[PDB]
């Protein structure tokens, strides 16, 4: 009976195995556009992605996961409202069973299809396991998906979606490149969290871009066609990875713009 996204073990049971889930900084938050303030001291967001190898891609039972090698400086964000560097581990995304929902953060209320998260650790923490532990030690860059016109750089994961269909398969993924995944814009919110999975550990410092890009409804009903399953076993469709928006509690979203 471990942890996942069904009536008995979703979200509103995770506190039972994982308490910090009733916490102080938990993610994700509805972003109150209004109230978000204005940080004129915010710098850019760095994204430097241009040396970034991907490896490998998985099907982990929750999500997809496209991981890269972190062990040099390769892919890393810096700048915006970070101190110091942190490194590109792997992204992936939550997602609807229908284009109305999938989305972890909202704004103003509004959920779209699905999001993106890219996961950074701090260099300063030596891994990803260490940095988790620590109070500044990931940041994650997150990117909402709405549906309209597709997104080619989306469509090599896409594609790739088919071999990894069950829980545990995993796939080489060399060479791609997900600077293909970015909006025009890096104008931001920021906010103190948390992962918005068990363990749920209160890591995280959460930039989420306010321009979404937008994936196609064919590329979406591609991430429905996987399976929290593993390989024969009863099939249960990926769908509806999400967990709704925590309390604010005492924090105040930052915003990069306006
Ligand atoms: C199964 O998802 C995870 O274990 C996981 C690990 C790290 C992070 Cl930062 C995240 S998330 N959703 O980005 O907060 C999710
Ligand atoms: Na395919
Ligand atoms: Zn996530």
């Given at each position: 009976?471990?942890?996942?996204?069904?009536?008995?073990?979703?979200?509103?049971?995770?506190?039972?195995?994982?308490?910090?889930?009733?916490?102080?900084?938990?993610?994700?938050?509805?972003?109150?556009?209004?109230?978000?303030?204005?940080?004129?001291?915010?710098?850019?967001?760095?994204?430097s992605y241009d040396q970034a190898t991907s490896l490998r891609i998985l099907?982990?039972?929750?999500?997809?996961?496209?991981?890269?090698?972190?062990?040099?400086?390769?892919?890393?964000?810096?700048?915006?409202?970070?101190?110091?560097?942190?490194?590109?581990?792997?992204?992936?995304?939550?997602?609807?069973?229908?284009?109305?929902?999938?989305?972890?953060?909202?704004?103003?209320?509004?959920?779209?299809?699905?999001?993106?998260?890219?996961?950074?650790?701090?260099?300063?923490?030596?891994?990803?396991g260490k940095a988790v532990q620590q109070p500044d030690g990931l940041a994650?860059?997150?990117?909402?998906?709405?549906?309209?016109?597709?997104?080619?750089?989306?469509?090599?994961?896409?594609?790739?979606?088919?071999?990894?269909?069950?829980?545990?398969?995993?796939?080489?993924?060399?060479?791609?490149?997900?600077?293909?995944?970015?909006?025009?814009?890096?104008?931001?919110?920021?906010?103190?969290?948390?992962?918005?999975?068990?363990?749920?550990?209160?890591?995280?410092?959460?930039?989420?871009?306010?321009?979404?890009?937008?994936?196609?409804?064919?590329?979406?009903?591609?991430?429905?066609?996987?399976?929290?399953?593993?390989?024969?076993?009863?099939?249960?469709?990926?769908?509806?990875?999400?967990?709704?928006?925590?309390?604010?509690?005492?924090?105040?979203?930052?915003?990069?713009f306006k």
């Amino acid at each position: 009976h471990h942890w996942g996204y069904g009536k008995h073990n979703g979200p509103e049971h995770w506190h039972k195995d994982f308490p910090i889930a009733k916490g102080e900084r938990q993610s994700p938050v509805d972003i109150d556009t209004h109230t978000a303030k204005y940080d004129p001291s915010l710098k850019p967001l760095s994204v430097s992605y241009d040396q970034a190898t991907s490896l490998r891609i998985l099907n982990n039972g929750h999500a997809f996961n496209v991981e890269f090698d972190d062990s040099q400086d390769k892919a890393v964000l810096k700048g915006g409202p970070l101190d110091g560097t942190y490194r590109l581990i792997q992204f992936h995304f939550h997602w609807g069973s229908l284009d109305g929902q999938g989305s972890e953060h909202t704004v103003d209320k509004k959920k779209y299809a699905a999001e993106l998260h890219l996961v950074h650790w701090n260099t300063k923490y030596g891994d990803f396991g260490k940095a988790v532990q620590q109070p500044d030690g990931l940041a994650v860059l997150g990117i909402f998906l709405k549906v309209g016109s597709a997104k080619p750089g989306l469509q090599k994961v896409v594609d790739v979606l088919d071999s990894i269909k069950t829980k545990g398969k995993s796939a080489d993924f060399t060479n791609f490149d997900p600077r293909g995944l970015l909006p025009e814009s890096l104008d931001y919110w920021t906010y103190p969290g948390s992962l918005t999975t068990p363990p749920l550990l209160e890591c995280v410092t959460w930039i989420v871009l306010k321009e979404p890009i937008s994936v196609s409804s064919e590329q979406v009903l591609k991430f429905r066609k996987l399976n929290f399953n593993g390989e024969g076993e009863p099939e249960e469709l990926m769908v509806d990875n999400w967990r709704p928006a925590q309390p604010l509690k005492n924090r105040q979203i930052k915003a990069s713009f306006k």
